[PDB]
Amino acid sequence: MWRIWQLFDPRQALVGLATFLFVLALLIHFILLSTERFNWLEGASTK
Amino acid sequence: MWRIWQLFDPRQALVGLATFLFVLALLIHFILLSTERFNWLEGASTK
Amino acid sequence: MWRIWQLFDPRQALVGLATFLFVLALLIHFILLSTERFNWLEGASTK
Amino acid sequence: MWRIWQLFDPRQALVGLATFLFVLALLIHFILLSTERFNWLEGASTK
Amino acid sequence: MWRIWQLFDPRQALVGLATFLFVLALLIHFILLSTERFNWLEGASTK
Amino acid sequence: MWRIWQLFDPRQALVGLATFLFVLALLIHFILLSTERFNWLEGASTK
Amino acid sequence: MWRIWQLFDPRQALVGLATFLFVLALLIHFILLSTERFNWLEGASTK
Amino acid sequence: EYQNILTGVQVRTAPHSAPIAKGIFPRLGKPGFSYWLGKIGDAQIGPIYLGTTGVLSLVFGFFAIEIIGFNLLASVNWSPMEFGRQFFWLGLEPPAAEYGLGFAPLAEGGWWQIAGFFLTTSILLWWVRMYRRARALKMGTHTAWAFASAIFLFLSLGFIRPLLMGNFSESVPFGIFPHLEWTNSFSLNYGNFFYNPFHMLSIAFLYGSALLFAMHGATILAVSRLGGDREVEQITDRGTAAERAALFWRWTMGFNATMESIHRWAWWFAVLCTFTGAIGILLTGTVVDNWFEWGVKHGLAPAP
Amino acid sequence: ITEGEAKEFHKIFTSSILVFFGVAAFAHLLVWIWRPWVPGPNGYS
Amino acid sequence: ITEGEAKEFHKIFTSSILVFFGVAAFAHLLVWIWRPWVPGPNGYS
Amino acid sequence: ITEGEAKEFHKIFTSSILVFFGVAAFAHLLVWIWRPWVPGPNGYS
Amino acid sequence: TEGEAKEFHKIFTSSILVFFGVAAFAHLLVWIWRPWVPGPNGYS
Amino acid sequence: ITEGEAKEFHKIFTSSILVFFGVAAFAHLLVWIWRPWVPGPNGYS
Amino acid sequence: ALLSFERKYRVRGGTLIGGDLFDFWVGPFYVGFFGVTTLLFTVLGTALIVWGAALGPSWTFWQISINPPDVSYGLAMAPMAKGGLWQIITFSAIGAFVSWALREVEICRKLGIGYHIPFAFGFAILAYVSLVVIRPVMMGAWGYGFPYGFMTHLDWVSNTGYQYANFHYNPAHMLGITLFFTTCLALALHGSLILSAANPGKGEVVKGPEHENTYFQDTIGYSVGTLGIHRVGLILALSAVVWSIICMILSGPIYTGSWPDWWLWWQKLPFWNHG
Amino acid sequence: NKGDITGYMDVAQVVLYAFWIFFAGLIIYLRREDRREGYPLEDAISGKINSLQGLGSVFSIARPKIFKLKTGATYAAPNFKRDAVAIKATRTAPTAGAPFEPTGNPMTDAVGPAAYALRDELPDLTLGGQPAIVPLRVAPTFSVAAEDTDPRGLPVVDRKGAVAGKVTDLWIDRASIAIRYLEVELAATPGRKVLLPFAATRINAKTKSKTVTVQSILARHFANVPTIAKTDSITRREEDKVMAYYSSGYLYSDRV
Ligand code: 07D
Ligand SMILES: CCc1c(C)c2cc3nc(cc4[nH]c(c(CCC(=O)OC/C=C(\C)CC/C=C(\C)CC/C=C(\C)CCC=C(C)C)c4C)c4c5nc(cc1[nH]2)C(C)=C5C(=O)[C@@H]4C(=O)OC)C(C)=C3C(C)=O
Ligand SMILES: COC(C)(C)C\C=C/C(C)=C/C=C/C(C)=C/C=C/C(C)=C/C=C\C=C(C)\C=C\C=C(C)\C=C\C=C(C)\C=C\CC(C)(C)OC
Ligand SMILES: CCCCCCCCCCCCO[C@@H]1O[C@H](CO)[C@@H](O[C@H]2O[C@H](CO)[C@@H](O)[C@H](O)[C@H]2O)[C@H](O)[C@H]1O
Ligand SMILES: CCCCCCCCCCCCO[C@@H]1O[C@H](CO)[C@@H](O[C@H]2O[C@H](CO)[C@@H](O)[C@H](O)[C@H]2O)[C@H](O)[C@H]1O
Ligand SMILES: CCCCCCCCCCCCO[C@@H]1O[C@H](CO)[C@@H](O[C@H]2O[C@H](CO)[C@@H](O)[C@H](O)[C@H]2O)[C@H](O)[C@H]1O
Ligand SMILES: CCCCCCCCCCCCO[C@@H]1O[C@H](CO)[C@@H](O[C@H]2O[C@H](CO)[C@@H](O)[C@H](O)[C@H]2O)[C@H](O)[C@H]1O
Ligand SMILES: [Fe+3]
C-alpha cells in the first residue's frame, strides 16, 4: 500500500489529512459538548 | 473486472470514492443520531 | 442488444448509470423512511 | 415507418424517449403516492 | 396532397407537434383530476 | 382576394395563425370552464 | 388617401393592424365580461 | 468625452464558436444578431447547447412549471380574467404539518411536493450541465461551484430545513406574493431575522457583491481605453491597464488586487452571500427558536 | 413567389377555411341546442 | 425538400393520424360510457 | 443514418416496443386486480 | 471503437445480473419482513 | 492506463475493498447485537 | 513600499485643489487636499461617534447608537446632548464621502483613467444623503433619519418597513431587490467565468475571449462580452441603488399608507374588475 | 436550553466563530492572490526590497502559479521582474513620498499617465493561432454592421476643432467582435500613419456632418504617436504603448 504516494502528493495529502482530522475532531468534541451525558464542562449527573 | 480502471483514472476514482464514502457515512451517522432508538449519545431507553 | 454501446460511450454511460441508480436508491430509501409502516429506524408497529 | 430513423438521429431519439418516459413514470408514481387509495406504502383501507 | 410538406421541415414539425399534443393531454388530464366528477383517483360519487 | 400570399410567406403565416387559433380556443375554453353555467365538467342545474 | 402605401408597406401595416384590432377586441370583450349587465355568460338579470 | 457605456459602432461577422466534441447532441439555435444587445454587449445570439443533461433538466423543469401553473390556474377556477387579477396573489402552498415529510394529498400539498421535487431535479441537472459544459470547453468549473452555493441556499429553504424540522409546512410556496409573505412570516415567527447573525453576514456579502461589482465594473470601464476590458489577456500578460487599475485602488485604499484575484473576491463574496444565508436558515427553528432572544443573550440587544 | 403557386395555396387555404368554419358552426349549433349563451331580459331561467 | 421523397412521408403521417384518432375516439367512447361529460338541465344528479 | 443503419435499429426498437408494452400491460393488469382505478356510479367500493 | 463493445457488454451484463440478484434478494427479504401491497381493509 | 499497472491496482484495490467491507460488516454485526434495526410486527418493545 | 511598477506613474499634477502642497503619498495612500479633508471629517465624525458611545449606556459595539433628534424638533438643529450630535456626524459623514470621491477624481486624473469609479461612488453617497437628508427634509423632521448604530439602524429599517405594514409590496422596492439579486448573480457568473478561463485545469492552456463567449453561448444561449459585462454590472448596481432611493422617497414623502393595499389598483382594472 | 453547548455558548455562536475563522483564512488566501503582481515591494527611493511587514511575510507571497499558453508559452505569477528605479523623472523632494517632475516631453518619454507596461512583442492570438487585432483590409470576412456610422474617411479632429487627419482603415479584434483602432493618415505628413484607439473616439453621428473627434490630445500631438512595425498585425507592447500615449493627453495636453 506504499504506492498510494505515487498517486497522491505526500505534502498535499498530508496537509489535507491533517486539516480533515482536525475539523473532524473539533466537530466530534463540540457534538460531545452539546450532549448532556458527555459534556465535561457543566458535568451533569448521569441520573 | 480489472479493465474498469482502463476507463477511469485510479487517482480521480480514489478521491471521488473517498469523498462519497465519507459523506455517506456522515449522513447515515447523522440520521442515526436523529432517531430516538439509535442515538447512542442521548441513550434513550429501548422500552 | 449488444450494439447499445455502439451508440453511446461506455464511460459516460457508466457514470450516468451509477449516479442515476444511487439517486434513485436514495429517493426510495427516503420515501420509505417518511412512511410509518416502513420506517425501520423509528419504532414501527403494524397495528 | 422503417425510415423514421432517416429523419431522427437514433441516439437523440433514444435519449429523448428515455428522459420523457422516466420523468412521466416518476410523476405517475408520485401522483399515486399522493392518494388515499393507491398509496401502496400508507396502505389506507379501501372502505 | 403530395406537395404540402415543402412548407415545414418534418423533423421540427413532428417534434413540435409531439410536444404540443403531450402538453395538451397533460393539461386535460390535470383538469379532469381537479374536477370532482372525473377525478378517477378518488372515489367521488355521481349521486 | 388571393394576392395576399405574394407578401405573407405561407410558412411563418401558417405557424402564427395556428398558434393564435390554439391560444384563442384555449382561452375560450378556460372562460367557459370558469362560468357556472357553461362548465361542462363540474355540472350544475340550469333551473 | 391611397398614398399611405408608399410609406407603410402592407406587410408591417397589416400585421400591426391585426395585432391592434385583436388586442382591442380582447379588451372590449373582457371589459364587458367584468360588467354584470353585459356578461353574456354569467347572464345576470337586467333588473 | 466617451465612456464605453454604449457601443456606437458595431461589428458583425460570421458566427463561430469554440470546438466541442460532437457528442449525442449537436449545437442548436441557428445563430442570429440583435442590435440593442450589441449596443450593451455582444450582438450574436446562440447557439444553445442541448445535451442529455440539458434535455433531462429541461423536461424536469418544464414538468414542474406546468404543474405549478396548472395549480395556479385551477385555484381560480380556470378563469383567465381572474387569473390575471390574482396572478401575484396566487401560490402553490406546501403541505401542512400533519403530513410530515411523506406524500400529502394532491390538493393538500402533494402537487407542491411533486413540483418541488421536479424543480430540484431540474436545478441539480442544470448544475451538472454547467459542470459538463465547462469541462467540455477545457475550462474550469468555478461557475458550477458558485451555482452550487445558490443551490445550497435553495435546498436549505425548500428541502433541508423541512428535513431537519421533519415538516414541509414551513417551506416556501410557489407564488409571487406568497413567497414574499413566506419571507415575512418566517422572519416574524422567529424573532426579527435581522438578529440572525448569518442573515447579517449574508446581507454584508450581498452589499459587498454590489459594491464590488460596481467598483470592478467602473475600474474596467475606466481602463477600457487601455485594453483593460480584455481581462484574461491582462492576467496572462500584465499591461498598463492592469497596472493603473491596481495603482488607483492602492493609492485610494492602501491595497489592491490583481486582474485575476479581483474576480476571486467577486466569486467569494457572491458565494458567501448564499452560503451564510443557507446556514442561517438551517439554524433557525432547529437550534435558535427566537433570534431576538439569541441577540439579547449575546449582546446584540439592550436586554429589555 | 410565383403567382400560380400562390393561387393554388389560396385555393387549398380557402378549402381549409370552409371545413374549419363549418366544423365550428356545427359545434356552436350543438352548444346552443344544449345551452344558449344569450340571456333573456330576466336572466337565465 | 423533394416531392418524390416526401409523398411516402405523407402516407405514413396519414396512417398515424388514422391510428391516433381511432385510439382517441375509442378512449372517449369508453369515458362516455363510464361517465358522460354533458350535463342536462338538472346538472348530473 | 443510412437505409441499412436504420433497419437493425428499427428491428431492435420495435422488439423493445413490444417488450415494454407487454411488461406495462401485465403490470397494469396486476394493479387492476389489486385495486381498480375506474370508479363505479357510487364511487369506489 | 465497436470491437471492444463485445467484451464491455459481456462484463456489463454480468454486473447487471449480479446487481439485480442482490436487489431481488433484498426485495424478497423485505417482503417477508413487511409486504408492501395492502389488502382491501388496508394494512393489518 | 497501462494494463500492467491496472492489474496491480485492481488486485490491491480489491484487497482494500475486501478489508473495508469486512470491517463495516463487523461494525454492523456489533450494532445488530446491541440493537437490531428491523422491527417486529408489534413495533420494537 | 512601492509595487514593481509603481515608481513610474508617481508623477505630480492631476489635483483639482491644492497645487503641489498636498500632492504626495503617505505609505501606499495618495493624500491630496481632499485626503486631508477626508481625514478632517473622518476623525471628527468618529470622535463624535465615540463621544456618543461614552454618553451612551453600553460600550457594546453593537449596542452603541447615535440617535437623531426626536421628530418634535422638526428640521431644527438640536442640542448636542439630544439629537445634535447625530446631525453633526451626518454632516461630517457627507463631507468625508464627498472628499473621498473628489480624491478619487484626483487619482483618476493623475493616472489618466476614466472617472467611472468616483461617479459610481456618487450613487452610494446619494443613497446615504437620501436616507439622512433628502427623505427627512421631505418628511419634515430629522428624526426620520436612521440612528448611527450597528443594530439600532436595523431596528430603524424594520420599524420603517413595518410602518407601511409590509414594505415588500413597495414596487420600487421589488425592482431594487431584483436588481440587487441580479447584480449578485451576474458578479458570481463573471468572476466564475474569468477564473475558469484563467485556471482551466491540469494542462489546459489559458482560454481566450472566444472560449468565454462560447461557454455562455452554450449554457445560456447568449454571451454579453468581456467588455459589456462590466458595463451591465455597473449599470445593475447603480440601478439597484437608484431604485432603492426611489422606493425610500416614495415611502413617507409621497406615500403614507399600506403598501400591500396599494396593489388593489391592479385588482380593479376595468377588464377584470368583476363588479 | 435547546440549542446550547456550554451554559452560555450555543450552536449558532459556535458556527459563527467557525465562519469567522474560515473568513480570516479566506482573507489571507485572497490577499496572497492579490500579491501576485508588483510584489515584493521596493523602497520608494533606493528600490531595495524593503517594506514594513510582519510575520505574515512568509505567508504574504505565494509560490509562482504557472499559466500555460496555446503557443507553448508560459507566464509565472508572481514573476519577480521589476521596473528600473531610474525613470525619466526626478523627485520633487527627496522624501520617498514626493511625486516626480518629468525631465522631458512626457508624451514620448512614457512617464506618468503615458507610461506603458513592458509587455511582450507578440500579438493577441485567436482560437486559430493568428493575430486578433488586424486591419479590416486583411480580414475580408469581417464587416461593419449597418445602422451605424461607418468611420472610414471621416475627418479626425481634436477638441479645438483642428482637423488632425483622416481615417482610412479600422483595426478590429477577432476574438471579440468590436473595433479597436482607427488608422489615421496625417494631413501634415502623408508618409506618416498612426493608430487611434476606438475607445478614444466620439461617434458624432448627430451634427451638421459626420466626423470623429478626440478630446485627449491636440492635432500636433499626432506627429509623435508611437509607430508600429508590421502595419497589418500589432504586438501587445506596441498597442499598449499607443494607448498609453493617447491616454496621457488629459493630464498634460497643454505643455508641462
Ligand atoms: C420581512 C422579511 C425579513 C427582513 C428582516 C429581511 C430584510 C432584509 N433582507 Mg433578508 N429579510 C427577512 C427575511 C429573510 N431574508 C432572507 C434572505 C436574504 C438573503 C437572500 C440572498 C439571495 O440571493 O437570495 C436569493 C437566492 C436564492 C433563493 C438561492 C438561489 C435560487 C435559485 C438557484 C433559484 C433557481 C430558480 C429557477 C431556475 C427558476 C424556476 C423556478 C421557479 C419558477 C419556482 C439576502 C442577504 C437578504 C437581504 C435582506 C436585506 C438587504 C434586508 C433589508 C434591507 O431589510 N435576505 C435569505 C437568507 O439567506 O436568510 C439567511 C432567506 O431565506 C431569508 C428570510 C426568511
Ligand atoms: C452566488 C449566488 C447567486 C444568487 C444571488 C442567485 C440568485 C438567483 N438565481 C436565480 C435563478 C437562476 N440562477 C441560475 C439559473 C439556473 C437555471 C436552472 O436551474 O434551470 C433549470 C430550471 C428549469 C429547466 C425550470 C424553468 C424552465 C423554464 C422557464 C423553461 C420552460 C420551457 C421549456 C424548456 C420549453 C422551451 C425552450 C426550448 C429550448 C425547447 C437561473 C437563471 C444559475 C446561477 N445562479 C448563480 C448564482 C446566484 N444566483 C450561478 C453562479 C448560476 C448558474 O450557473 C446558473 C445559470 O445558468 O446562470 C446563468 C434566481 C431566481 C435567484 C433569486 C434571486 O431568487
Ligand atoms: C410555460 O408556462 C405556461 C403555461 C405559460 C405557464 C405555466 C406556468 C406558470 C405561469 C408558472 C408560474 C409560476 C410562479 C409564479 C412561480 C413562482 C415561484 C417562486 C417565487 C418560487 C420561490 C421559491 C420556492 C422555493 C425556493 C421552493 C423550493 C422547494 C423545494 C426545494 C422542495 C423540494 C421538495 C422535495 C424534494 C420533496 C420531497 C418529498 C417527496 C417524498 C415528495 O419527494 C419525492
Ligand atoms: C431518481 C430521482 C430523480 C433524479 C433524476 C435522476 C436521473 C437524472 C440524473 C442522472 C445523472 C446524470 O449524470 C450525467 O448523465 C449524463 C447522461 O444522462 C452524462 O452526460 C452525457 O450527456 C452529456 C450532455 O452534456 C453529453 O456530453 C454526453 O452525451 C454524456 O456525457 C454524464 O456523464 C452524467 O454525469
Ligand atoms: C398497456 C399500458 C397502458 C395501460 C392502459 C390500461 C387502460 C385500462 C382502462 C380500464 C377501463 C375499465 O373500464 C371499466 O371496466 C370495469 C369492469 O371491468 C367497470 O367496473 C367499474 O364499475 C363497476 C360498477 O360499480 C364497479 O363495480 C367496478 O369496481 C368498477 O371497476 C367500469 O364501469 C368500466 O369503466
Ligand atoms: C425488483 C423488485 C420487484 C418487486 C415486485 C413486487 C411484486 C408484488 C407482488 C404482489 C403479490 C400479491 O400478494 C398478495 O397481495 C395481496 C393484495 O393484493 C395482499 O393481501 C394480504 O395482505 C394484506 C396487507 O398485508 C392484508 O389485507 C391481508 O394479509 C391479505 O389480504 C398480500 O400481499 C398477498 O396475499
Ligand atoms: C456488509 C455490511 C452491511 C450489512 C448490511 C446487511 C444488513 C441486513 C439486515 C437485515 C437482515 C435480515 O435480518 C433478519 O430480519 C428479520 C425480519 O425479516 C428479523 O425478524 C425476526 O426477528 C425480529 C426481532 O424483533 C422478530 O420480531 C421477528 O418476528 C423475527 O422474524 C430477524 O431478526 C433478522 O435476523
Ligand atoms: Fe472583470
Side-chain angles (χ1 to χ4, degrees), chain O residues 47-80:
Chain O
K48 67 184 289 184
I49 293 290
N50 212 39
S51 62
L52 188 153
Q53 171 153 69
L55 293 177
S57 66
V58 298
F59 281 109
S60 85
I61 305 300
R63 65 179 64 88
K65 83 195 292 174
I66 287 299
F67 297 115
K68 281 174 58 67
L69 277 296
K70 53 189 89 182
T71 48
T74 293
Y75 188 59
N79 52 332
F80 312 101

Side-chain angles (χ1 to χ4, degrees), chain N residues 40-59:
Chain N
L40 187 153
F41 284 113
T42 299
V43 167
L44 188 153
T46 307
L48 286 194
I49 289 180
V50 181
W51 170 229
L55 299 152
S58 284
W59 278 122

Side-chain angles (χ1 to χ4, degrees), chain O residues 1-205 209 211-256:
Chain O
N1 203 0
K2 170 192 67 154
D4 62 356
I5 292 172
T6 187
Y8 174 84
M9 183 179 72
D10 55 296
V11 180
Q13 158 180 37
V14 167
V15 182
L16 197 57
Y17 275 107
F19 167 87
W20 286 127
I21 297 314
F22 162 76
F23 195 59
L26 171 76
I27 287 308
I28 286 166
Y29 169 79
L30 289 174
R31 291 299 291 142
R32 287 171 48 88
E33 301 302 299
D34 299 350
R35 289 181 277 258
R36 280 209 198 268
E37 294 293 328
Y39 274 85
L41 301 156
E42 46 188 47
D43 201 321
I45 298 298
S46 64
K48 67 184 289 184
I49 293 290
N50 212 39
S51 62
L52 188 153
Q53 171 153 69
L55 293 177
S57 66
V58 298
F59 281 109
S60 85
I61 305 300
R63 65 179 64 88
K65 83 195 292 174
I66 287 299
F67 297 115
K68 281 174 58 67
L69 277 296
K70 53 189 89 182
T71 48
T74 293
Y75 188 59
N79 52 332
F80 312 101
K81 294 145 66 86
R82 327 178 65 92
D83 295 18
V85 189
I87 62 170
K88 279 201 197 103
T90 184
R91 286 295 191 123
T92 51
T95 74
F100 274 88
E101 292 293 330
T103 64
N105 167 48
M107 294 296 172
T108 61
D109 285 305
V111 176
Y116 67 93
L118 183 63
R119 305 179 92 175
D120 52 2
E121 318 208 317
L122 295 168
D124 291 331
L125 277 297
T126 81
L127 204 42
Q130 51 188 342
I133 308 299
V134 289
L136 259 177
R137 319 169 317 101
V138 292
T141 63
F142 276 82
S143 73
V144 174
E147 290 97 10
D148 290 334
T149 304
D150 186 74
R152 292 179 181 175
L154 296 176
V156 168
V157 304
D158 48 35
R159 42 152 192 269
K160 295 215 199 93
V163 189
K166 185 177 180 180
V167 57
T168 70
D169 196 358
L170 323 180
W171 294 54
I172 54 174
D173 188 45
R174 278 190 201 135
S176 67
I177 323 302
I179 291 172
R180 284 292 170 265
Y181 290 152
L182 313 179
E183 200 196 71
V184 175
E185 185 138 20
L186 276 298
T189 309
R192 184 182 180 79
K193 189 66 64 68
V194 298
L195 285 158
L196 188 154
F198 185 43
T201 77
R202 298 293 296 163
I203 297 89
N204 211 350
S209 65
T211 189
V212 165
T213 187
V214 55
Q215 279 62 237
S216 62
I217 66 168
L218 312 170
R220 58 162 202 283
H221 292 128
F222 287 80
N224 317 113
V225 177
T227 73
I228 73 170
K230 300 295 187 291
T231 62
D232 54 354
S233 72
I234 170 163
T235 79
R236 284 178 205 107
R237 194 210 304 293
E238 283 162 31
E239 65 183 1
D240 194 72
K241 186 183 287 185
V242 176
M243 292 180 183
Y245 172 85
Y246 267 100
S247 164
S248 66
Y250 317 84
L251 181 53
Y252 35 81
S253 186
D254 291 331
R255 284 314 305 259
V256 192

Side-chain angles (χ1 to χ4, degrees), chain H residues 2-21 23 25-304:
Chain H
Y2 189 55
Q3 295 298 109
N4 286 316
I5 300 297
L6 286 163
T7 318
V9 188
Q10 281 175 71
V11 194
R12 284 194 172 94
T13 187
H16 200 69
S17 63
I20 303 177
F25 270 94
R27 267 169 187 152
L28 196 56
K30 52 180 68 62
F33 304 119
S34 179
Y35 196 81
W36 314 130
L37 303 193
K39 286 290 293 173
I40 70 174
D42 270 21
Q44 184 205 351
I45 306 298
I48 190 167
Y49 184 88
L50 180 67
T52 300
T53 180
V55 179
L56 284 153
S57 194
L58 285 190
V59 173
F60 272 104
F62 192 60
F63 263 93
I65 301 299
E66 294 294 328
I67 282 161
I68 292 174
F70 292 166
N71 274 280
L72 297 193
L73 193 56
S75 77
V76 295
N77 204 35
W78 314 100
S79 165
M81 284 74 74
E82 184 66 26
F83 184 79
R85 172 182 285 173
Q86 302 175 223
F87 166 68
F88 309 126
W89 296 258
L90 289 188
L92 191 47
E93 205 70 56
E98 65 183 1
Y99 293 116
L101 304 166
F103 287 85
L106 286 180
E108 289 258 345
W111 279 125
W112 182 95
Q113 290 166 314
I114 293 168
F117 183 87
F118 281 3
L119 193 73
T120 287
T121 302
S122 47
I123 283 160
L124 289 163
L125 273 157
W126 196 266
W127 184 91
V128 176
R129 179 163 182 276
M130 314 297 285
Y131 196 104
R132 293 191 67 76
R133 285 306 95 214
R135 285 311 198 213
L137 287 170
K138 299 288 95 176
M139 281 165 96
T141 44
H142 299 72
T143 309
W145 294 113
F147 187 29
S149 174
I151 299 163
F152 183 38
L153 176 52
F154 163 84
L155 289 182
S156 166
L157 285 183
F159 190 63
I160 306 179
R161 194 184 176 283
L163 272 173
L164 301 184
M165 306 285 300
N167 219 4
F168 279 118
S169 79
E170 208 165 10
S171 198
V172 56
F174 295 118
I176 306 289
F177 285 171
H179 94 291
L180 310 168
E181 301 279 13
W182 172 90
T183 310
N184 193 296
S185 70
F186 205 74
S187 174
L188 293 181
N189 282 319
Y190 296 109
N192 203 331
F193 201 73
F194 289 162
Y195 287 84
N196 184 342
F198 294 92
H199 189 242
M200 298 180 235
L201 288 172
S202 197
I203 292 182
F205 288 122
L206 180 66
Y207 287 173
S209 160
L211 158 65
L212 213 65
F213 192 24
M215 289 174 62
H216 176 61
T219 300
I220 291 310
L221 287 175
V223 300
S224 79
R225 296 161 200 151
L226 311 180
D229 68 90
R230 295 188 298 273
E231 293 180 300
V232 177
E233 302 177 357
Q234 306 261 341
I235 284 157
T236 300
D237 186 41
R238 204 203 50 238
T240 199
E243 289 175 336
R244 287 173 216 211
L247 283 182
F248 170 86
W249 290 113
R250 175 158 204 84
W251 298 351
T252 190
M253 199 171 56
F255 66 104
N256 59 278
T258 300
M259 189 67 73
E260 190 276 331
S261 84
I262 182 57
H263 302 95
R264 302 202 164 280
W265 286 88
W267 193 96
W268 272 110
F269 269 56
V271 160
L272 287 173
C273 169
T274 57
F275 177 79
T276 45
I279 300 311
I281 289 300
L282 291 187
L283 259 54
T284 178
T286 69
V287 163
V288 186
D289 291 331
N290 196 245
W291 279 116
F292 178 77
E293 306 285 356
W294 188 93
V296 170
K297 165 168 172 259
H298 288 279
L300 288 173

Side-chain angles (χ1 to χ4, degrees), chain N:
Chain N
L2 297 196
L3 294 175
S4 302
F5 43 85
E6 187 154 6
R7 193 185 32 242
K8 182 175 73 175
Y9 310 88
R10 285 204 157 193
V11 287
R12 59 169 283 165
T15 175
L16 300 171
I17 300 178
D20 51 303
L21 187 54
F22 295 161
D23 199 13
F24 64 88
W25 289 262
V26 166
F29 309 93
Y30 164 78
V31 178
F33 168 86
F34 289 113
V36 159
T37 54
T38 188
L39 303 188
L40 187 153
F41 284 113
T42 299
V43 167
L44 188 153
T46 307
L48 286 194
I49 289 180
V50 181
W51 170 229
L55 299 152
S58 284
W59 278 122
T60 309
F61 180 59
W62 305 308
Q63 311 187 18
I64 288 163
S65 52
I66 313 304
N67 293 316
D70 195 276
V71 287
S72 47
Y73 290 102
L75 283 189
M77 186 66 204
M80 299 282 329
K82 65 179 72 66
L85 183 79
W86 180 97
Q87 297 171 317
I88 308 293
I89 290 162
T90 293
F91 303 139
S92 286
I94 294 164
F97 300 157
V98 165
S99 311
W100 192 263
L102 280 163
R103 180 174 81 105
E104 287 182 338
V105 171
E106 322 182 89
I107 298 160
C108 279
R109 293 179 66 189
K110 184 176 296 287
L111 284 145
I113 62 169
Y115 322 104
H116 293 91
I117 298 140
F119 178 75
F121 183 42
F123 283 81
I125 308 163
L126 180 64
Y128 167 74
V129 163
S130 290
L131 278 172
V132 302
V133 172
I134 290 173
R135 188 180 187 265
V137 166
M138 300 190 179
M139 297 197 67
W142 288 115
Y144 300 119
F146 59 93
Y148 293 140
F150 188 88
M151 279 293 322
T152 55
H153 90 284
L154 302 194
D155 298 325
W156 175 89
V157 168
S158 184
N159 282 342
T160 59
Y162 284 118
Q163 175 151 62
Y164 317 96
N166 209 322
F167 184 76
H168 280 140
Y169 282 104
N170 187 340
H173 192 250
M174 314 185 158
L175 197 58
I177 290 175
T178 295
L179 297 163
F180 266 114
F181 283 167
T182 311
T183 311
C184 203
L185 159 59
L187 179 78
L189 297 175
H190 178 62
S192 299
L193 180 59
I194 294 302
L195 289 191
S196 86
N199 316 98
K202 278 89 165 181
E204 308 315 316
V205 307
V206 173
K207 293 314 171 307
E210 69 275 16
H211 276 277
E212 313 170 77
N213 280 307
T214 312
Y215 180 71
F216 278 118
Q217 283 176 337
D218 290 340
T219 59
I220 299 181
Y222 173 69
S223 188
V224 183
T226 186
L227 162 66
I229 180 57
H230 303 91
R231 298 209 190 121
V232 309
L234 169 75
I235 297 169
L236 270 163
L238 298 194
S239 278
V241 165
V242 163
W243 276 109
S244 69
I245 293 160
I246 291 176
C247 81
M248 276 309 256
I249 296 309
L250 280 168
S251 300
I254 298 176
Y255 192 47
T256 59
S258 173
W259 276 120
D261 55 43
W262 178 88
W263 288 87
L264 273 69
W265 79 261
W266 172 276
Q267 299 274 270
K268 55 190 173 63
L269 278 72
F271 37 80
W272 55 77
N273 59 341
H274 187 273

